[PDB]
Amino acid sequence: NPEPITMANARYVSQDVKFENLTNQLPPPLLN
C-alpha cells in the first residue's frame, strides 16, 4: 500500500553508495 514517505516511516542514516541520489521531487524529510 504505497504511502507518502514521512517521518513516521523514515529514519536518518549515514551515506551509502547503494542508496538513491534523488535530485527532484524530494520527500519532506529531505528538504530545506
Ligand X SMILES: *[C@@H]1O[C@H](CO)[C@@H](O)[C@H](O)[C@H]1NC(C)=O
Ligand Y SMILES: *[C@@H]1O[C@H](CO)[C@@H](O[C@@H]2O[C@H](CO)[C@@H](O)[C@H](O)[C@H]2NC(C)=O)[C@H](O)[C@H]1NC(C)=O
Interacting residues with its own copies (CB under 8 A)? 3, 6-9, 12-14
Footprint of ligand X on residues 1-32 (CB under 6 A)? 17, 20-21
- 31 contact choice in ligand Y, ligand X, its own copies, none (CB below 5 to 8 Å, kind-dependent): none
Map grid coordinates 504505497 to a residue. Answer: 2
Instruction: Determine the Cα angle at 21 with ends 17 and 25, to 5°.
Output: 160
Which residues, at least 6 apart from 5, have a Cβ–Cβ distance to it below 8 Å?
Answer: 27, 28, 29
Which residues ranging from 1 to 32 are in contact with ligand Y (CB under 6 A)? Answer: 17, 20-21
Give the footprint of ligand Y on this chain (CB under 6 A).
17, 20-21
